[PDB]
Amino acid sequence: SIRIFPRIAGRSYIIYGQTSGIICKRMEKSDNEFVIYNYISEHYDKFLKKYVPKLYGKNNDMLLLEDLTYNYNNPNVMDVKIGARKRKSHTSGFFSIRGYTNSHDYKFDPDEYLTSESTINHIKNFMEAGGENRDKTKQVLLKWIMKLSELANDLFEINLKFDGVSLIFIYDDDCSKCDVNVVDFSRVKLIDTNDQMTISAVTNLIKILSELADNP
């Protein structure tokens, strides 16, 4: 009947859809996540199409979402919180890594505040599954940089406060495919300006990833 989806982070009930390519995410406390998907669709439809999993529909309290891991033979996933946290400061100052595929092997702890060096080391840990072909892993980094650059550029024109939103980074072990998308609109709010904190998270990630793609 019910297959639990292998979540990297967060607390919401998420299960595989009864059909291929879909996950079902329960809206726990309010339907705010649905209201915000609908609002972005009406006001910023190009943003939704480029950066966000497709919302196929709703069943009671369940969102039917595009499974971002579906087209991958061996997906590696990292959840980075880029929007404001509820109370805490970010573990990496401008963002918080929330989890990644195989993080347990590296003694990753989502409660641990990280130096710049430890932050970089966890991102390198996440990239270890991608293997020793430095050319192929560099290309994954560059394609993430391309899309995050455009996202940061685009965010200047969006009047939302992206509280609690995460970037879901995905690459295949063979490094033949990768993407990054924005998820988790449960705490997002309308405002009258752009979200500078969320833009700062994205530019900081671009800086770090650019250093990784350039290191010899």
Ligand X SMILES: Nc1ncnc2c1ncn2[C@@H]1O[C@H](COP(=O)(O)OP(=O)(O)O)[C@@H](O)[C@H]1O
117 is in an annotated binding site: no
Looking at beta carbons only, is 6 or 131 nearer to ligand X?
6
68 is in an annotated binding site: yes
| Contacts with ligand ZNQ, residue ranges (CB under 6 A) | 10-11, 81, 85-88, 164
Measured distance CA(173)–CA(153) in Å, rounded: 29
- Using CA atoms, how far residue 178 sits from 61, 127, 172, in Å, is 30, 12, 6
Quote the distance between the C-alpha of residue 215 and its chain's center.
24
Quote the distance between the C-alpha of residue 162 and its chain's center.
12
Q: Which of 22, 51, 55, 69 touches ligand X (CB under 6 A)?
A: 69
Binding site partner of 195, from Mg ion, ligand ZNQ, ligand X, none, Cβ cut-off 5-8 A by kind: none
CB of 209 to ligand X, least distance (A): 19
41 is in an annotated binding site: no
Binding site partner of 29, from ligand ZNQ, Mg ion, ligand X, none, Cβ cut-off 5-8 A by kind: none
79 is in an annotated binding site: yes
Looking at beta carbons only, is 137 or 186 nearer to ligand ZNQ?
186
Candidate segments 19-27, 113-121, 136-144, 160-168, binder of Mg ion by CB under 5 A:
160-168
Q: Which pair of tokens denotes residue 94?
A: 């401008």
End-to-end CA distance of the chain: 50
Contact between 172 and ligand X per CB under 6 A: no
- Using CA atoms, how far residue 112 sits from 125, 127, 147, 180, in Å, is 16, 20, 28, 24
Q: Which of 76, 91, 186, 198 touches ligand X (CB under 6 A)?
A: 186
Contacts (Cβ under 8 Å, ≥6 apart) of 70: 20, 21
Beta strand ranges found along 53-177 (DSSP E): 55-59, 62-66, 75-81, 96-100, 160-161, 166-172
Looking at beta carbons only, is 119 or 166 nearer to Mg ion?
166
Binding residues for Mg(2+): 184
Binding-site positions for 1D-myo-inositol hexakisphosphate: 29, 81, 85-88, 187
Residues annotated in a binding site: 8-9, 11-12, 25, 29, 66-68, 79, 81, 85-88, 184, 187
